[PDB]
Every structure is written in structure tokens, then in C-alpha cells.
Design a binder for this molecule. Sequence first.
Ligand SMILES: *[C@@H](O)[C@H](CC(C)C)NC(=O)[C@H](CC(C)C)NC(=O)[C@H](CC(C)C)NC(=O)OCc1ccccc1
Length: 220
Amino acid sequence: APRSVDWREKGYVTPVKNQGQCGSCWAFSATGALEGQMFRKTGRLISLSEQNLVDCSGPQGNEGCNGGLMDYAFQYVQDNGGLDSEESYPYEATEESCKYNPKYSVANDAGFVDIPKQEKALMKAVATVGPISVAIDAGHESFLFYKEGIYFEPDCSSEDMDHGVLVVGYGFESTESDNNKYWLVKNSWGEEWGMGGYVKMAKDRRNHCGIASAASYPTV
Ligand SMILES: *[C@@H](O)[C@H](CC(C)C)NC(=O)[C@H](CC(C)C)NC(=O)[C@H](CC(C)C)NC(=O)OCc1ccccc1
């Protein structure tokens, strides 16, 4: 595989969004991956409605602001026959009744693909598919205060993930400890967090924070 990948440079990634005080990260991860695959298909980048997923994908197993899974979101888009644009169904950071309108659907998928639980497989998927939905252990103060550099948290769990995010690439940079590889991750906490909303997460360090443990993307 390549040693560096950044799908932002190829037009696959919308700007950083902000889930607010709603446990809807899974929806932002899901729209991010679907935005990328829709762009792969049509050559048009359209921001998608996380609120549509928060309000409507309960029957697939999601629980609004109380948590969800990206794969359940991909199943909803398939089952439902569409997903509205961000513009048509904007984000309110609270769960409401479903207001999906098929007239404003701009995205579809025919299922999803779960990636083997290995960083080697995740790298191959990032290199060849596009942005990949992943789950990580983000429950540490170090993650809140992240400014720059490669994020490494010794107390991070590789099995107990609690936050869905989007891998948009990977790369390297020289460091004091010579742990130089990172995943480029788009978060959903706004631009003021991290590096313009992004974090470089330790790569090839025993599946740090579980980033390869629940990786998937929609089939478009
Ligand atoms: C982030 O905004 C949000 C916070 C709320 C839980 C308050 N996190 C999630 O929704 C979280 C993301 C996943 C990808 C880790 N989902 C869950 O915690 C999930 C919610 C249920 C209601 C679907 N709970 C769970 O046990 O998910 C199973 C799982 C977790 C990790 C990998 C595979 C499967």
C-alpha cells in the first residue's frame, strides 16, 4: 500500500461538523463514509443529514442521541431507499420524530462491508476504497485536550470503543519515540477541537484505541 493517503485532497470529504451535546457520533461517521462513496460514484460531494439518521434509523437498531452504529445507519439507507441532504434536513442535536422526505434523497447504498479486525486490512481499505467508518476509545481527557501531533494514550482500550469517527487517510512524521505512523481521523466536535477538527491517531501500535476493531464502509 502507499505510505501516505489523504482523501481530502481528492474531494471525498466535507468540512468538519459538530454533533453538539448529542451522542450521535455514529451518524456523523456514517454520513462521512457515505459522502465519500457517493463522491466516488457520482463525482459530486453532497453533505448528508445526520438528523435523518438520528430520527429514523431506530428500526435498524440505532438509539438516536443515546448511541448507534454506522452499520445500522448503512442498513437504514438501504432499507429506506434513500437519505436526505444536510441542507434539506439539518442537524438539531436532539432526537425527534422521523421527517424523511424521499424527494430530497441524494444518497443510497446497497449494504456495507465490514473490514477484518487488523490494521493491515484497514490500511488496504483506506488506500483503495476511500474514507472508512471506525469506532475508537475516546474516553480519556487526553483526547479532549488534543492539539497536534500523534495521539497516543497508554490507557486506551482496543476492545471497548465508544466513539465513531472517520479515517480519511494515514501518513507519518518523525517523533521523539520513533512511533511515526498515524491514521488521519475526522472527528465531529467542530473545528476548534484538535487540528482543525482532525486528529492523528497512533497507527500500527497494537490496534491503538480499537481503531481497526469496527471498521466498515457502505456499498454504493
Ligand atoms: C458518540 O457520539 C456516541 C456516544 C453515545 C453512546 C452517548 N457513541 C456511540 O453511539 C457508540 C459508537 C460505536 C461505534 C462505538 N455506539 C455504542 O456505544 C452502541 C450503541 C447502541 C445503542 C447501538 N453500543 C454498543 O454496544 O455498540 C456495539 C459495538 C461497539 C463497538 C464495535 C462494535 C459494536
